[PDB]
Amino acid sequence: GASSSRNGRDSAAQRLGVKRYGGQVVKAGEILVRQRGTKFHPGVNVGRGGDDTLFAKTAGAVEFGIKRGRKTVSIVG
Amino acid sequence: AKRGRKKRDRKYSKANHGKRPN
Amino acid sequence: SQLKITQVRSTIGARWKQRESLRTLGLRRIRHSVIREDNAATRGLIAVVRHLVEVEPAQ
RNA sequence: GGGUGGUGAUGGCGUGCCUUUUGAAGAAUGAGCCUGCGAGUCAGGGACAUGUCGCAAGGUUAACCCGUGUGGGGUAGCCGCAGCGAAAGCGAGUCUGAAUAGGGCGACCCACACGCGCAUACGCGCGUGUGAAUAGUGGCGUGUUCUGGACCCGAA
RNA sequence: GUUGCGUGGUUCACCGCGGAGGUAGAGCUACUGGAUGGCCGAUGGGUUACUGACGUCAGCCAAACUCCGAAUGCCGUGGUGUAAAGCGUGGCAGUGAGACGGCGGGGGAUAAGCUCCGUACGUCGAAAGGGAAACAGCCCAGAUCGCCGGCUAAGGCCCCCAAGCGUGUGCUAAGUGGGAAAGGAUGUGCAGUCGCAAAGACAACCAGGAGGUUGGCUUAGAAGCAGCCACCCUUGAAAGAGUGCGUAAUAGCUCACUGGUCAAGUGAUUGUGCGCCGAUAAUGUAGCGGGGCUCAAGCACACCGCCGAAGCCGCGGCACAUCCACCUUGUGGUGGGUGUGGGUAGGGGAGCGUCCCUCAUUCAGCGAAGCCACCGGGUGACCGGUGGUGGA
RNA sequence: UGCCUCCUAAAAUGUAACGGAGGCGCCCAAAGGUUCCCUCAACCUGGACGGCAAUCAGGUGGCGAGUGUAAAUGCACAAGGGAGCUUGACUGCGAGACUUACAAGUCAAGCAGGGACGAAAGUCGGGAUUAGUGAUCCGGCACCCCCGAGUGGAAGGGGUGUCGCUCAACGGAUAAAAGGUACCCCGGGGAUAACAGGCUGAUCUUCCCCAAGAGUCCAUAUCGACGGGAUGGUUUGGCACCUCGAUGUCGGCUCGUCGCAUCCUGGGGCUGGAGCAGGUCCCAAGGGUUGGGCUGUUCGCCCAUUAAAGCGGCACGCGAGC
RNA sequence: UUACGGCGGCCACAGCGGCAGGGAAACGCCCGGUCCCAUUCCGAACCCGGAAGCUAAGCCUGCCAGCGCCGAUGAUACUGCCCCUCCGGGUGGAAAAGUAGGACACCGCCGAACA
Ligand SMILES: [Mg+2]
Ligand SMILES: [Mg+2]
Ligand SMILES: [Mg+2]
Ligand SMILES: [Mg+2]
Ligand SMILES: [Mg+2]
Ligand SMILES: [Mg+2]
Ligand SMILES: [Mg+2]
Ligand SMILES: [Mg+2]
Ligand SMILES: [Mg+2]
Ligand SMILES: [Mg+2]
Ligand SMILES: [Mg+2]
Ligand SMILES: [Mg+2]
Ligand SMILES: [Mg+2]
Ligand SMILES: [Mg+2]
Ligand SMILES: [Mg+2]
Ligand SMILES: [Mg+2]
Ligand SMILES: [Mg+2]
Ligand SMILES: [Mg+2]
Ligand SMILES: [Mg+2]
Ligand SMILES: [Mg+2]
Ligand SMILES: [Mg+2]
Ligand SMILES: [Mg+2]
Ligand SMILES: [Mg+2]
Ligand SMILES: [Mg+2]
Ligand SMILES: [Mg+2]
Ligand SMILES: [Mg+2]
Ligand SMILES: [Mg+2]
Ligand SMILES: [Mg+2]
Ligand SMILES: [Mg+2]
Ligand SMILES: [Mg+2]
Ligand SMILES: [Mg+2]
Ligand SMILES: [Mg+2]
Ligand SMILES: [Mg+2]
Ligand SMILES: [Mg+2]
Ligand SMILES: [Mg+2]
Ligand SMILES: [Mg+2]
Ligand SMILES: [Mg+2]
Ligand SMILES: [Mg+2]
Ligand SMILES: [Mg+2]
Ligand SMILES: [Mg+2]
Ligand SMILES: [Mg+2]
Ligand SMILES: [Mg+2]
Ligand SMILES: [Mg+2]
Ligand SMILES: [Mg+2]
Ligand SMILES: [Mg+2]
Ligand SMILES: [Mg+2]
Ligand SMILES: [Mg+2]
Ligand SMILES: [Mg+2]
Ligand SMILES: [Mg+2]
Ligand SMILES: [Mg+2]
Ligand SMILES: [Mg+2]
Ligand SMILES: [Mg+2]
Ligand SMILES: [Mg+2]
Ligand SMILES: [Mg+2]
Ligand SMILES: [Mg+2]
Ligand SMILES: [Mg+2]
Ligand SMILES: [Mg+2]
Ligand SMILES: [Mg+2]
Ligand SMILES: [Mg+2]
Ligand SMILES: [Mg+2]
Ligand SMILES: [Mg+2]
Ligand SMILES: [Mg+2]
Ligand SMILES: [Mg+2]
Ligand SMILES: [Mg+2]
Ligand SMILES: [Mg+2]
Ligand SMILES: [Mg+2]
Ligand SMILES: [Mg+2]
Ligand SMILES: [Mg+2]
Ligand SMILES: [Mg+2]
Ligand SMILES: [Mg+2]
Ligand SMILES: [Mg+2]
Ligand SMILES: [Mg+2]
Ligand SMILES: [Mg+2]
Ligand SMILES: [Mg+2]
Ligand SMILES: [Mg+2]
Ligand SMILES: [Mg+2]
Ligand SMILES: [Mg+2]
Ligand SMILES: [Mg+2]
Ligand SMILES: [Mg+2]
Ligand SMILES: [Mg+2]
Ligand SMILES: [Mg+2]
Ligand SMILES: [Mg+2]
Ligand SMILES: [Mg+2]
Ligand SMILES: [Mg+2]
Ligand SMILES: [Mg+2]
Ligand SMILES: [Mg+2]
Ligand SMILES: [Mg+2]
Ligand SMILES: [Mg+2]
Ligand SMILES: [Mg+2]
Ligand SMILES: [Mg+2]
Ligand SMILES: [Mg+2]
Ligand SMILES: [Mg+2]
C-alpha cells in the first residue's frame, strides 16, 4: 500500500493561555497568561517576559481590560 | 443481511427506547 | 415559600451534577422527601434534578 | 385430625465448576470417580513501615567466658547524641558569595507540673521531674523488601 | 483502591459576582482561498460577433477562512447546602488487553458487532432483581437477612401470562399493525386555494364544425398530416392551411367551438393522518415470541383503574460507621438516634477447623481416637447431644 | 521514530490514528544592547535612456508590505526601516510562578558588583515569540589551591568554568554486532494471519427509478446513455468477533437436500407476432437437466447428442464416507 | 464666561470626508542661518536667532450620514438539561446577519481678557 505517512509528526502542546483569570488574587512573580506573541499586553503592575509571559510584579487582583484596542492584563494591589 | 437488519431493528421497541447493545 | 421535594427516580445513571444536587438537597432514596426553603439556590438545585424529583409548595 | 421422615404427580423459575477473557452455558482451557498427597516458607542484631514491651539521653551487646537450661557475665562494636561543606574547615550554624545581599541545608524539639533570675497572683528563659512512645534504642509480632530455589509446576 | 497518622471544610452541588475564549452558528466589499449569474471594460486574439483583467450588481462556500459569535465547559470568589468531601504524608496494592450504548469528531465508502480520540456521559467489566421472547454493554432499578404484607418503576393488562376481550372520540382494510429505498399510484379521512353554473354547471345526445394565405419543399405527394417549415383575415349558433387515428396523395373516422336537447354540483389544486405497490435466497411456518386479533386484542388523542422488581414502605433479626446521654465519660460498655451494608483485582479487620508443645483443669477398658447414623445448634468457617461401631 | 508550528481538538488546559499540512539539527559580531529618527505595500498622475515593473516628484493609501528562517500568535505604539555609540551574547543571586510521573523544560520582579546606551527616566542576564538539540558515565582543557596514603613535595584526586556522542531507534540495552532455517525445536496466542462462520457490502450480483437517444416515423416490440435507488450475500475484499491444550485445506467420487434469480417441459401478456420460428416480460420448482476430449483443476473451450444440457445455498454440503 | 490657548482620560456613537466662520493672548504658518545642532543631498525636517506678513493651511467652532462606525426589540440559527423512535417536544440560555434607529463625541487638570 501507499506509504502516505508523509505527515505524522507534531510538536508538544505548550500549555499556553490565561493562567490567572479576572479578579483572582495572585502573588508577585506569578505568571498570569503564557502565550505566543502579545495576545495580551502588560498593563499596570504586569511584566511581559522574555517569551511574552505576563507575570505579576506585585501581589493583588488580576484584571483584564482594553487599552486602545490592545487587550491588557493588570494587577490592582 | 437479514439477521443483521432484524437485530438492528429490535432496538425500536418501547422497552428498549430506541437503544440496544451492538 | 417552603418547598417539599420528593425523589421519584433513581440516581442510577444520573450525571455527577444530578447526583450531587440530590445529595445537596439531602435526598437519599426513592420517595425520600425533604423540606427546604424556596430560595434561588434551592430552585437551581431542583432545576438540575427536575426529572428525578417532584416538588410541591407544602408547608 | 396433627406433626416427623421417605417419595414426589403436577405448576413456575432456572445457561455446570474452574481458568481466562471486552465478553463463555459456551462448540475456549482443565477435570472419569474417590481416597491420600500437592503451592508466599525459612535464615539473617539484614532494609522500610507498623503493633507491642523494656530501658531511656541513653539503649544494646557480638564473639567469647562461666553455668545440668532457657541463667549470669562480656563495652569490642552499633544506633542515638549537631549540622553545614567537595574539602580544608567552621559549628547552632554552615556553604556559595565581594556582600552586616539573597538563597540552600541545618537549629529553634513535646504535654503536664514545680523550681528559680521574678511579672501584684497570670511568664520569657533555664533547671529538676513524670511521661516508666519522651527521643532514641533493644527485644518480640505483622506487612513489604533484599540475598538465597524464595509461592508451586513446566521447556527447547 | 485500601489503610495508618495528621489537617479540617479546604471537596462537591446550587445561587450570585469577576474573568479568558473562537467551537456551534453565522458572515465574508472584514482577510485568505473556492466559486454562480449579470453589466462595463485593460489586454490578447482574427478594423474587431472572438478573450474578458479590474471593477460593479446580486446569490453562495471553507477543519487548517474570520469583521463576528453563542450554549455548555473552565478559573476565581462570596453565600447556601451536603457526614463517610478534599488535601498532606506513610504501609499494602491491583490495574496499565477494555466492551457496548448516547452525544461531538477523525480514518473508512460520513461501510462494519470496524478503527482512533473526546465526553464530573452511562452501563457492563466487577451488578443480582424487573422489562426487552431468548438476549454483558438498552430501559427500570443497585440484592444485609427473613415475611404466604402493602405501594410503585420500566414495561404491561384477550389466552399463553399477573393486571382491561377498560371508557370516549375518530382513523386503518393493508393482518397495515407485526422490517426497507429511489420512485409509481382516481386508496382513504381531515384541513385549506381557484374556474363554471337555474341567464340551466360536468356526464350523455342531434345539428354543425370552412374559403381564399394548401407558403418553403421532400417529390408520385406535402396539400398539417415520410419530417422541418406560411406564423393571418373573413356569410356565420360556433368554426385552425386543424387535437389524436390514418393513406403516395386525393381522400376517410373525429377532437378544438356553440345552439337546442336532459336536470344539481362539478372540476382542477395544496399540506397533511393512516394505508397500497416497489418487496426479492436457499433445513420448516420463520419480520406479532405463540395462539389468535379489525365484533381490535391495531393506530391517534383524552381519561380511568389495575399488574408489575431483591426499588420504596410495613414488621422482625444482624452488621458497619458516626453522634448524643448514663456507667472508672475512652480499655471502653449501655440506651437511643442518623447514615450505611452488590462486588472482580485488591486493601483492611475479625474468626472457624486440624496437629504439636507448655501450664491448669477435667474425661477415658463402667470404653478415648477414628468412623457411621439420627436429633439438635450457631451470622460463617463449623459445633453439640444421643446411639452404633471400635479398642487407647 | 527527537524537536518546532498549525488543523483534527468538540471557544480553558490536554487529547489518538501508518489522520491532514509544513519546518528544524541553524544563522547573526549584528540580524545582540541602547538612544534617537522614520513608515510600508499597492494604486493613480507626470517624468532622458527606462519599458507593466530600476531611480524621481506629487497625491491616495492604517496596514493588503515587512519580520534571517516553517507555522501560529504577534508587531504600524511598531517587534517593520535607518543612524550613533556599544558588548548585558554579563558575574554573584533570585521572592514567586508555569509546566510536569520522574528526569527535564519555562518565566521571573527585584538585590549587589562592574558596565553599555541615554540629558534623564530608565532599558540591557542575546535575537518579536515558540524549533536549531542529547541524560548519565568516562575522559580532556583552563583556573582555584581543596585533599595530598609516614613527613615535605609530587603523582593522582576534588571544586569552578568549559569541551568531547546523526548515542537521529534522538529517556541515550554494549566501547564493540548482519543474515538464513521448508531441518527446525520449545514457550505462548484465536491478544494475530491463512480455511470456514459472523458483521459490512466498496467490489460483485440481480433488479428497479428517470428517460438522452437507437429502433424508416415512434423513448418505452427490442436496446437503452448520463445520473439515481435498492436486493442478494454465491466474487474479490474490509473488519478481526468464535476456534491456535487443532474447526483438515482445492478438485473429483458417493449421497443428497434446499432456494428460484427457470435450462427443458406446463400456463400466459406484449411484439418491430402473417406462418414456422423467435424476442421480451409475467406465472410456474412437479419431474428432468447426457456421454466424451483437454486440464489437478473449479472454470472454460471443444466433440457428439439432447426437450434441456439452469444458476445458486447447505463449513465455496459431504475425508470418524472414499 | 468666550469662535482662545495650554496636558490626559477614551480610541470611530469619537473616525474620514465635504461646506462655511474664526486670529485679543496663544497655537501656527512665516523671515533668516554670524551664533549650539542637522540633512545617508537639501536650514524641507531637526535645531537656533527674529517678528516684516498672514489666517491660505494646521488648529478651533458650527452644520452636513456623504464614506464609514455603533445598533436594539422581536424572530431565527445554534445550544445546556430534560421528555421522547426520528420528525419532534418541554425548559433555561441565545447569536451572526438584517431592520428600527443612534451618531459629525463625552469627561478631566492652568493661563488672557472678562469680572
Ligand atoms: Mg501545538
Ligand atoms: Mg530568548
Ligand atoms: Mg477482567
Ligand atoms: Mg477473545
Ligand atoms: Mg468446555
Ligand atoms: Mg458442551
Ligand atoms: Mg488459548
Ligand atoms: Mg479434558
Ligand atoms: Mg558530609
Ligand atoms: Mg543562611
Ligand atoms: Mg517505647
Ligand atoms: Mg515466625
Ligand atoms: Mg521455574
Ligand atoms: Mg496510599
Ligand atoms: Mg459569569
Ligand atoms: Mg462567555
Ligand atoms: Mg481555529
Ligand atoms: Mg460551521
Ligand atoms: Mg476574494
Ligand atoms: Mg464574473
Ligand atoms: Mg470556524
Ligand atoms: Mg502496556
Ligand atoms: Mg492499552
Ligand atoms: Mg479506548
Ligand atoms: Mg460518532
Ligand atoms: Mg469495536
Ligand atoms: Mg463513546
Ligand atoms: Mg443485569
Ligand atoms: Mg435483568
Ligand atoms: Mg425473561
Ligand atoms: Mg397497585
Ligand atoms: Mg408507568
Ligand atoms: Mg411462559
Ligand atoms: Mg390473567
Ligand atoms: Mg390500553
Ligand atoms: Mg369490547
Ligand atoms: Mg379495548
Ligand atoms: Mg401482520
Ligand atoms: Mg407486516
Ligand atoms: Mg415502504
Ligand atoms: Mg417484506
Ligand atoms: Mg431495599
Ligand atoms: Mg460487601
Ligand atoms: Mg445495597
Ligand atoms: Mg477480593
Ligand atoms: Mg472390656
Ligand atoms: Mg460398646
Ligand atoms: Mg489424634
Ligand atoms: Mg455430628
Ligand atoms: Mg459418641
Ligand atoms: Mg465413638
Ligand atoms: Mg483547546
Ligand atoms: Mg473544549
Ligand atoms: Mg521532515
Ligand atoms: Mg544593534
Ligand atoms: Mg525596527
Ligand atoms: Mg552565550
Ligand atoms: Mg528560585
Ligand atoms: Mg548597577
Ligand atoms: Mg552618562
Ligand atoms: Mg532584570
Ligand atoms: Mg527566531
Ligand atoms: Mg554506563
Ligand atoms: Mg605524603
Ligand atoms: Mg607513601
Ligand atoms: Mg594537578
Ligand atoms: Mg557557582
Ligand atoms: Mg525513545
Ligand atoms: Mg551505551
Ligand atoms: Mg528442499
Ligand atoms: Mg509449538
Ligand atoms: Mg480474535
Ligand atoms: Mg475469513
Ligand atoms: Mg465455526
Ligand atoms: Mg446489503
Ligand atoms: Mg478491536
Ligand atoms: Mg479441545
Ligand atoms: Mg419466478
Ligand atoms: Mg411469449
Ligand atoms: Mg427441478
Ligand atoms: Mg403434484
Ligand atoms: Mg485417450
Ligand atoms: Mg446443488
Ligand atoms: Mg467444501
Ligand atoms: Mg459445492
Ligand atoms: Mg474432498
Ligand atoms: Mg466429516
Ligand atoms: Mg492674535
Ligand atoms: Mg527655513
Ligand atoms: Mg480658513
Ligand atoms: Mg436579540
Ligand atoms: Mg447584528
C16: three-class secondary structure by DSSP: helix
Q: How far apart are CA A58 and CA A42, in angstroms?
A: 13
User: Ramachandran region of residue C8, left (φ > 0), alpha (ψ -120 to 50) or beta?
Assistant: alpha
Q: What are phi and psi of A47, to 5 degrees?
A: -95, 165
Chain G positions with a protein C-beta closer than 7 Å: 10-12, 81-86, 91
Task: Give A31's DSSP letter.
Answer: B
Question: Reported resolution in A?
Answer: 2.3
Q: Shortest CA distance to A64 belongs to which of A41, A34, A37, A38?
A: A41
**Residue A45: which nucleotide is closest by CA–C1'?**
F109
| Residues A19, A8 contacting (CB under 8 angstroms) | no
- The number of angstroms, rounded, from the C-alpha of C26 to the middle of its chain's C-alpha atoms is 8
SS3 content of chain C, % helix, strand, coil (to 5): 35, 25, 35
| SS3 per-residue string spanning B1-22 | CHHHHHHHHCCCCCCCCCCCCC
Q: C-alpha cell of A25?
A: 488574587
| Residues A28, A58 contacting (CB under 8 angstroms) | yes
* Domains of chain C, CATH where assigned: 1-59 (3.30.1390.20)
**Ligand 41 center–CA B14 separation, angstroms:** 22
From the Cβ of C51, is strand G under 7 Å away? yes
